[PDB]
Amino acid sequence: MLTEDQIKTTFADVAGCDEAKEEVAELVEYLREPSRFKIPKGVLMVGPPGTGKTLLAKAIAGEAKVPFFTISGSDFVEMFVGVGASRVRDMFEQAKKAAPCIIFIDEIDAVGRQRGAGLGGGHDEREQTLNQMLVEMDGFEGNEGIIVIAATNRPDVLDPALLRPGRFDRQVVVGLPDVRGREQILKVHMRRVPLAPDIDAAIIARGTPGFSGADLANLVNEAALFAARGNKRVVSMVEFEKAKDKIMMGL
C-alpha cells in the first residue's frame, strides 16, 4: 500500500537531532529545487531503535514543503509476504505524479532481508517486491526530485544489491543523543508536564547514557505514570528514579 502523510512534520516537531538535521540540509534543498542540483536517489537513515529515523524523514519533507509517502510491502501487519512487482510499480507511478516528494520504504530490514543463499528468489513475492523497488529507483531520471528513504541499524545485513550506486548509496547517521542532547530532548518532553522544584534535566541526562529519543520520551511518561500511581500533583526526581529503573529491567 501507498499512504501519504496528511499532517506536515518539520524540524520543529523533532526533539534534538541537531547533527542529523544539519546533515540532511542538502536533501531538503534538492527537494525544494531539484533542477538546481551526486544527485540524491536513495538514502538510508542509519541508527538504533528510537532515534527518530522515520520522523526525521517526515521532517525533511515538511522542511522542503513536499509530500511524504510511505510504501508498505505487505498487506498483513505482523508478517512480510510481499506485494509483487506490479503493485510496486503502481505505487511508484502514483507517488511520482506528486514529485518532488519523499517515498519512504517501510521496514527495509524485512524487505531487504537475504533469503536465497545467493541463488535468487524466483517467484517468491518477497523478492519480487524487493527487486521491483530496485528497478524503480534505477528508472529515475534524476530531474524528478524524488528521494527514496528507508531506515535500519544494520545496512550491511541488507541485500547488497540495495546499496549499489544509484540505489541506497547514501547513509545518514541518526544516532543516540549525547548528554547535551538528552537534556535538550528531556526539556522538550517535560514542557507540558508539571514538575517539582527538585527536577533537574541535566541530572536526569547524566544518569541516562545510551537512551534514545524514544527512551527519553518514555522515561518522562513512566515518571508521570509513577506520579499518578502515587497520587502526586507534580512529577519529582524520585519518580524519574523509579522510571529509569523500571526501564532498566526491560533488558
Side-chain angles (χ1 to χ4, degrees):
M1 179 52 56
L2 176 71
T3 66
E4 185 178 1
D5 277 17
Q6 299 298 296
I7 294 174
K8 173 176 220 87
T9 301
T10 70
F11 290 158
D13 301 308
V14 174
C17 291
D18 290 344
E19 188 164 321
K21 285 171 185 174
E22 207 220 336
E23 183 75 338
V24 302
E26 187 171 296
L27 306 182
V28 172
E29 293 173 2
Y30 174 65
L31 290 160
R32 283 180 172 152
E33 188 188 289
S35 83
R36 120 75 143 117
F37 285 56
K38 168 201 175 193
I39 293 217
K41 283 252 261 184
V43 175
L44 292 172
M45 302 301 197
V46 180
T51 57
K53 298 179 297 294
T54 297
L55 183 68
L56 183 62
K58 292 176 169 166
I60 292 164
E63 290 291 325
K65 298 184 173 72
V66 300
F68 182 88
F69 293 108
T70 302
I71 289 182
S72 170
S74 190
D75 289 341
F76 305 102
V77 311
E78 307 195 35
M79 186 180 301
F80 172 57
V81 306
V83 294
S86 186
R87 283 176 70 185
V88 171
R89 178 160 48 248
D90 291 353
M91 293 191 278
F92 272 84
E93 177 167 299
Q94 178 156 168
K96 296 167 74 195
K97 289 174 184 168
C101 63
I102 286 176
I103 302 173
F104 189 97
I105 307 295
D106 255 17
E107 302 201 331
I108 202 77
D109 287 329
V111 180
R113 177 153 310 132
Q114 296 185 77
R115 296 185 178 92
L119 299 182
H123 307 289
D124 181 343
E125 290 281 87
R126 294 171 296 188
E127 203 189 77
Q128 299 263 326
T129 295
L130 170 59
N131 288 347
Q132 190 65 28
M133 282 168 180
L134 300 190
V135 167
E136 289 295 335
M137 294 170 74
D138 293 346
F140 285 4
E141 293 162 344
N143 72 111
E144 298 101 337
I146 302 179
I147 303 181
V148 181
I149 305 185
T152 181
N153 202 29
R154 290 291 181 263
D156 292 328
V157 161
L158 298 173
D159 185 336
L162 278 162
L163 306 196
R164 302 186 72 192
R167 295 169 181 168
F168 290 100
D169 67 4
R170 261 165 189 266
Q171 292 175 30
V172 172
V173 172
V174 188
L176 298 166
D178 59 30
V179 73
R180 211 149 68 9
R182 294 195 287 278
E183 179 180 357
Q184 176 184 30
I185 292 167
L186 288 162
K187 289 181 189 170
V188 175
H189 297 302
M190 292 157 26
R191 202 98 135 189
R192 285 183 125 293
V193 175
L195 304 175
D198 78 8
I199 292 289
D200 188 324
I203 290 182
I204 300 165
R206 292 172 167 199
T208 49
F211 276 47
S212 70
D215 292 331
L216 296 165
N218 237 21
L219 177 67
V220 173
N221 287 337
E222 294 288 7
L225 186 57
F226 272 116
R229 261 172 128 269
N231 203 24
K232 302 301 192 316
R233 206 177 145 318
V234 304
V235 186
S236 328
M237 290 293 271
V238 71
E239 283 90 24
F240 277 91
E241 184 187 317
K242 291 174 178 338
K244 179 168 303 211
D245 285 354
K246 156 171 186 60
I247 288 185
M248 311 306 224
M249 205 172 176
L251 176 178

